[PDB]
Amino acid sequence: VSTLIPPKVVSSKNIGSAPNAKRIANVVHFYKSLPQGPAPAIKANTRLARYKAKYFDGDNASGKPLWHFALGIIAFGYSMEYYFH
Amino acid sequence: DESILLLTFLGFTGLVAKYLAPAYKDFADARMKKVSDVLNASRNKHVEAVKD
């Protein structure tokens, strides 16, 4: 009797394995990926984006904006001492 | 009077920048590395799936 037709019916091996699910994710995801990002934000020259550029970089954990920002509040109230005295 | 207090604040920031800021740098670095490594690992993981 003639061989049956199972080997040639493939359309439930298109969901049949788990990486089909992953495939339909990364055919979208990686295809819509850019070569490099859009932009990281670091500066924009609003003149305080420069503050971010010098101090608040991705790799700058350096305490300098803190010191500067602290010193700003010291400059503020010290003048206000002379506003009240 | 209050300039003595400001001198104390200056000393306080001096101790912080001496000791803590390199430690916090190292701490921040450590976590950043871990996040990044996980992230890049995930990228590897899906690349495997493509081949599979």
Curated annotation (Swiss-Prot), chain A:
Q: Please state where this protein is localized.
A: Mitochondrion; Mitochondrion inner membrane
Is Transit peptide found in the keyword set?
yes
Q: What is its main location?
A: mitochondrion
Q: Which domain of life is it from?
A: Eukaryota
Q: Does the keyword Calcium apply?
A: no
Per the entry, what this protein does is:
Mitochondrial membrane ATP synthase (F(1)F(0) ATP synthase or Complex V) produces ATP from ADP in the presence of a proton gradient across the membrane which is generated by electron transport complexes of the respiratory chain. F-type ATPases consist of two structural domains, F(1) - containing the extramembraneous catalytic core and F(0) - containing the membrane proton channel, linked together by a central stalk and a peripheral stalk. During catalysis, ATP synthesis in the catalytic domain of F(1) is coupled via a rotary mechanism of the central stalk subunits to proton translocation.
Q: Name it.
A: ATP synthase subunit f, mitochondrial
Swiss-Prot record, chain B:
> Which cell locations does it reside in?
Mitochondrion; Mitochondrion inner membrane
Q: What does this protein do?
A: Mitochondrial membrane ATP synthase (F(1)F(0) ATP synthase or Complex V) produces ATP from ADP in the presence of a proton gradient across the membrane which is generated by electron transport complexes of the respiratory chain. F-type ATPases consist of two structural domains, F(1) - containing the extramembraneous catalytic core, and F(0) - containing the membrane proton channel, linked together by a central stalk and a peripheral stalk. During catalysis, ATP synthesis in the catalytic domain of F(1) is coupled via a rotary mechanism of the central stalk subunits to proton translocation.
- How is the subunit organization of this protein annotated in UniProt? F-type ATPases have 2 components, CF(1) - the catalytic core - and CF(0) - the membrane proton channel. In yeast, the dimeric form of ATP synthase consists of 17 polypeptides: alpha, beta, gamma, delta, epsilon, 4 (B), 5 (OSCP), 6 (A), 8, 9 (C), d, E (Tim11), f, g, h, i/j and k.
* Other observations noted: Present with 12900 molecules/cell in log phase SD medium.
Q: Which residues form a coiled coil?
A: none
**Species the sequence originates in:** Saccharomyces cerevisiae (strain ATCC 204508 / S288c)
Membership in a protein family? Belongs to the eukaryotic ATPase B chain family.
In Swiss-Prot or TrEMBL terms, this protein is called: ATP synthase subunit 4, mitochondrial
Domain of life per record: Eukaryota
